[PDB]
Design a protein around this ligand. Structure first.
Ligand SMILES: OC[C@@H]1O[C@@H](O)[C@H](O)[C@H]1O
Ligand SMILES: OC[C@@H]1O[C@@H](O)[C@H](O)[C@H]1O
Ligand SMILES: OC[C@@H]1O[C@@H](O)[C@H](O)[C@H]1O
Ligand SMILES: OC[C@@H]1O[C@@H](O)[C@H](O)[C@H]1O
Ligand SMILES: OC[C@@H]1O[C@@H](O)[C@H](O)[C@H]1O
Ligand SMILES: OC[C@@H]1O[C@@H](O)[C@H](O)[C@H]1O
Ligand SMILES: OC[C@@H]1O[C@@H](O)[C@H](O)[C@H]1O
Ligand SMILES: OC[C@@H]1O[C@@H](O)[C@H](O)[C@H]1O
Lengths: 482, 482
């Protein structure tokens, strides 16, 4: 009644490297006090916090979304370029604070370069215009002698940045968004901004705004499905109950199959192969203020593992995802003036990113399942999930075919699972199992005790057939040389 | 690379008996000269063709849809009740025929009772009204002293008919439909007809019109998803190419999944468990006139077995389906004045209906798959399907646990397939394998040659593990005791 069968020789499909994306918004101390802190003993001469920088390089960020989020829908990018001392101080409506703009476009790109991530910039469709968006694209990507390409060179960067991912607005349906639009307004505006941006630079990928309103998604696909590359989806979840939290991996799964089906229902979008960008996701239910310093625990980390395993299996449909967010705001990493904490949600990434392959292989899982009705999110909205598994898994192999990674999540709250595993054509080998867990479902790391929740390993012997015992509330990756 | 693993002890879910339903429209010779022929040497005293009756009873019709189809949208049911000699001749706009109304509601119910089928009545939303629908329902189902209940008694039937299935309109989106409606009009009207019909009889099930326009489906679900029980889907397919035909089983599958996901995205409909009625489906690509006498061949037969196997596996989502149509019009059975022909589409049902269980058991199938771009239907619309299997199967057990049915489709056009089969805990035993196929993919039955395409049987030996070889373009059921 539990079991895993893997066939390393049967490659199902690629795993998009961009499922492991991240997001830094100008929110609270995400930027200021987070990744960037001018004159800290802990910061380099660009103002980047070095301890943060090290934590971020460790999770090999493939792409990084900035600057929003609600923030961007009242952000004028030209306020954040040029000599820092000449940049205007603005009041940010999203999160109600003074924004000095000392972190702007050039610093963001320098940050992305430093960490090896592709920049992914959202534009302002709230108080912003088409002209303003085209100017940002011109500044970032122009090769010629246009005013904004020259301005990039003038401020110190002759080579174009070549930003590939552009978000065509953020959450434009929500009445919390500055300049929020009806479905018909937004669908027409997404087509409009995307087509002219692609006229200036045909190489960009355009992510249009999606949500849970199927009519909204359909208007966007209908109107703009001939020019956009992704429709986005945001997913925030969680409650105090362990199972209500982790079970929502499978709520998310059904949501995404839904949006994939709407894409199939619009001919031009289906034929062009428009995909989904899960460009914000996380647990978020405890804290509701202007800083969002959600104290993630292990339960939340298991949720994050479950999603990464899901995305490995579904990346042909959802090739781009972004955890919200990297530092402090809904933060994977939490900083103080004199240190940082790695939350269990960061650990989910540290585990999967470092112990996963580039191709998904055939993985058949047998599992007991459970039904649940709970609440999620800061408003405690009822949901329900049917036949959520207690055990999930994804087997992948490295590009060179030399390594197999069997990622396994045991969602059971109280019982360890003894799981029979078959791997086709595998000899007897020593292998290492890397496990994320901790003493209880509510364990957290603190400055006090930075390592209560961490990745530990043990060596085991594997064969064509073997059993392993997976701890309750844990994610493990079995790593095997082929 | 091909294989079937069955566990008879793991019941996955019920198989709704209503997936084997049928449909007789007042179109061409489906009624007059089809199921019904007054004064024929081949007819009983009710005017029912006795040779047709025998063939229909052989396929154990669980429900029968009537009178349309396009016909019902200009049909006034009161024209079809009372002494036949006084019923008015009407011009049917849908098929351009004089309709004598000599076959009407009372004859239909009597036909249903003869064959043992639940009546499924579609109402007229084209030229009809709410009152007129309510009067039909009251005539059929009233057990009190209302005028129309008394009227049914007056015409000879004191007991109510208890019609359980009501179709709220037919294809009301189509410009071909008399009185066709926009999505908003139909959505509101479906809610209105359904709610008041259910005030008079709350035990009926109501099927609302769906189609391939996702905005249409969603307006119906949003407006009426609190009262309806199914949204209907119609699927017609085929071309002269063998694989282009049979592969559309998996195009159907994806269509159905998409409609299922629309349901999931409408809170009231999802919570209430609204399902799908596939209330018209068949091959239909060669004939385009007002008689629709489509010459089905074996290829179309294998398509139909293929849909039946799919429906056994998805009947919790699609509990009701009706092949269009039973006799002559797109007909499973073809009649002439002096006899009939059982087409291979009829043989599909003769096989599955007689060799299937009421419960679906754990069935895992391994199979090579293919991709195809083809054309379908009378307009030769292009379609594409990804990873269709060459082999598929479903295993079911009888209600009393005594029998196991393994239905297997081999879609391979050219090669037999020796296939390993595992049945958990199965003794070594004798089984009978019933198989449907014929000389070639374009084989048909005729009056001359009525058994070119027929079901054969041979005894075989089965065990916990055995192999069986399946003919190309064939469907078989392995019927095992215990
Ligand atoms: O990530 C926090 C907020 O969540 C979403 O509502 C917004 O896009 C973002 O600003
Ligand atoms: O801010 C998170 C929000 O909760 C949901 O209603 C919004 O659509 C989603 O973006
Ligand atoms: O209450 C709405 C919650 O915010 C969103 O992220 C969740 O998906 C949505 O259901
Ligand atoms: O079955 C023939 C026709 O096909 C569908 O378009 C109509 O509902 C039916 O009258
Ligand atoms: O008449 C069969 C039809 O082909 C499709 O366009 C219609 O919607 C379907 O009912
Ligand atoms: O081209 C219209 C065809 O008629 C319908 O039955 C098929 O689904 C549709 O694609
Ligand atoms: O498999 C054939 C069917 O089983 C029998 O009961 C039916 O009469 C026969 O036609
Ligand atoms: O002829 C096929 C019939 O179907 C089976 O149920 C009957 O026993 C067999 O006679």
């Amino acid at each position: 009644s539990y079991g895993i069968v893997v066939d390393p020789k049967e490659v199902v499909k690629p795993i998009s490297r961009h499922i492991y994306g991240h997001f830094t918004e100008h929110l609270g101390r995400c930027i200021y006090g987070g990744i960037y802190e001018e004159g800290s003993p802990l910061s380099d001469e660009r103002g980047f916090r070095k301890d943060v920088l090290e934590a971020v390089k460790r999770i090999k960020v493939p792409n990084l979304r900035w600057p929003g989020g609600n923030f961007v829908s009242n952000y004028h990018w030209e306020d954040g370029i040029g000599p820092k001392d000449q940049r205007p101080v603005r009041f940010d409506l999203a999160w109600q604070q003074e924004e000095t703009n000392r972190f702007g476009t050039d610093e963001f790109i320098e940050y992305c370069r430093e960490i090896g991530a592709e920049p992914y910039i959202s534009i302002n469709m709230g108080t912003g215009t088409l002209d303003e968006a085209l100017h940002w694209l011109e500044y970032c990507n122009g090769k010629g002698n246009t005013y904004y390409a020259q301005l990039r060179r003038k401020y110190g960067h002759p080579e174009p940045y070549n930003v590939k991912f552009w978000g065509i607005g953020n959450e434009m349906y929500g009445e919390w968004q500055v300049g929020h639009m009806t479905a018909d307004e937004y669908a027409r505006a997404a087509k409009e901004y995307t087509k002219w941006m692609k006229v200036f630079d045909p190489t960009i990928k355009a992510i249009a705004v999606g949500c849970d309103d199927p009519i909204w998604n359909l208007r966007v696909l209908q109107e703009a499905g001939d020019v956009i590359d992704f429709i986005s989806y945001h997913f925030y979840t969680g409650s105090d109950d362990y199972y209500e939290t982790v079970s929502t991996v499978y709520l998310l799964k059904e949501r995404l199959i839904g949006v994939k089906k709407l894409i199939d229902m619009v001919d031009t979008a289906r034929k062009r192969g428009v995909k989904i960008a899960l460009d914000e996701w996380n647990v978020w239910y405890r804290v509701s203020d202007n800083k969002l310093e959600e104290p993630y625990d292990l339960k939340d980390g298991i949720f994050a593992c479950g999603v990464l395993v899901l995305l490995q299996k579904m990346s042909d449909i959802v090739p781009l995802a972004n955890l919200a967010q990297l530092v402090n705001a809904l933060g994977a990493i939490h900083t103080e003036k004199d240190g940082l904490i790695l939350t269990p949600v960061y650990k989910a990434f540290e585990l999967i990113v470092n112990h996963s392959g580039e191709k998904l292989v055939k993985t058949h899982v047998e599992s007991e399942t459970y039904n649940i009705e709970g609440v999620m999110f800061i408003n405690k909205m009822p949901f329900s999930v049917e036949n959520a598994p207690f055990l999930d898994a994804a087997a992948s192999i490295s590009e060179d075919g030399k390594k197999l990674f069997i990622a396994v999540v045991n969602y059971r709250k109280e019982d360890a699972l003894k799981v029979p595993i078959r791997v086709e054509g595998l000899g007897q080998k020593k292998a290492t199992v890397y496990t994320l867990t901790g003493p209880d479902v509510n364990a957290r790391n603190t400055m006090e005790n930075p390592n209560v929740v961490d990745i530990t390993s043990e060596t085991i012997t594997v064969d064509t057939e073997f059993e392993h015992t997976f701890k309750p509330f844990s994610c493990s990756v079995i790593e095997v040389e082929l």
